[PDB]
Amino acid sequence: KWNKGYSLPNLLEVTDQQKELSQWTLGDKVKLEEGRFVLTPGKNTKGSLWLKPEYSIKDAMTIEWTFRSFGFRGSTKGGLAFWLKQGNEGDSTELFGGSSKKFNGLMILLRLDDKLGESVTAYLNDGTKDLDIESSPYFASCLFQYQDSMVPSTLRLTYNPLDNHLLKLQMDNRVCFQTRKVKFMGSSPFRIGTSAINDASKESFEILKMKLYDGVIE
């Protein structure tokens, strides 16, 4: 059902890290520890997980990330990003440990937004300008509690070009937003990943599971 080539293996069940994670790039301080990835294991650390192969959609797709933030509740500029990006590259991690401020794609961000607070905010960039997280606009949002939970959450992104590019984003099976503004994935290969950065308070951003499906799931 899920596309193994564009998913994480069951992390707990991994016996050969090198073989079963061959399709993934571990960036910066991310470590596999007792069955999950800790993106930000230390004070003021960054980490990322990126799929090596670019993904080309057939009809529709679903991406499900299972994540949590553990160990810290309070004020911080740290956050956790989920990315769909297209076009060339660079090695920048200036934006949430994951990207240049100038990128072409979609960033779905869990952070303390300066006006919403604890939230999911979704941003599009077309590669021509620097995203300033304070002043650049997001196109969609919801309020969502994530700090300091052992209990993980699932972000589910469904995207169907055949339904005029309907993208739905659910958090724990509840709709955060729906949009038809994100169209680039229908007609171009793109890269899939996640990244996070914390501060000295040592917020632990963690990835427990990731699955991609070559369709819209019931």
Q: Name the segment binding K ion (CB under 5 A); options: 21-29, 55-63, 95-103, 172-180.
A: 21-29
Query: Is residue 142 part of the contact set for K ion (CB under 5 A)?
Result: no
Nearer to K ion, 24 or 67 (CB): 24
- State the chain's maximal CA–CA distance in angstroms: 45
Report the residue number whose CB is nearest to K ion: 21
Residue number with CB closer to K ion (37 or 159): 37
According to the binding rule CB under 5 A, does residue 21 interact with K ion?
Answer: yes
Q: Cβ 27 to K ion, closest distance in Å?
A: 10
Provide the sign of the torsion angle of the four alpha carbons 83, 23, 65, 215, taken in this order.
positive
Binding mask 22-61 for K ion (x = CB under 5 A): --x-------------------------------------
Round to whole Å and give the CA distance between 125 and 216: 25
Binding string, 70-109, against K ion, x = CB under 5 A?
----------------------------------------
The residue whose two tokens read 């553990």 is 70
Distance CA 130, CA 100 (A): 8
Size of the site for K ion (CB under 5 A): 2
Least distance in angstroms from the C-beta of 32 to K ion:
10
Quick check: 14 binds K ion (CB under 5 A)?
Answer: no
Residue 174 near residue 167 (C-beta atoms within 8 A): no
Give the interface segment with K ion, choosing from 14-22, 41-49, 53-61, 100-108 (CB under 5 A): 14-22
State which residue, 27 or 97, has the beta carbon closest to K ion. Answer: 27
**C-alpha separations of 152 from 38, 67, 68, 200 in Å:** 13, 5, 5, 22
* Listed ranges 16-24, 39-47, 89-97, 167-175: which one lies at the site for K ion (CB under 5 A): 16-24
Token code pair at residue 81: 């990003």
Q: Residues 41-46: contacts with CB within 8 Å, 24+ apart?
A: 41/204, 42/202, 43/198, 43/199, 43/200, 43/201, 43/202, 44/198, 44/199, 44/200, 45/197, 45/198, 46/93, 46/97, 46/195, 46/196, 46/197
Binding residues vs K ion (CB under 5 A): 21, 24
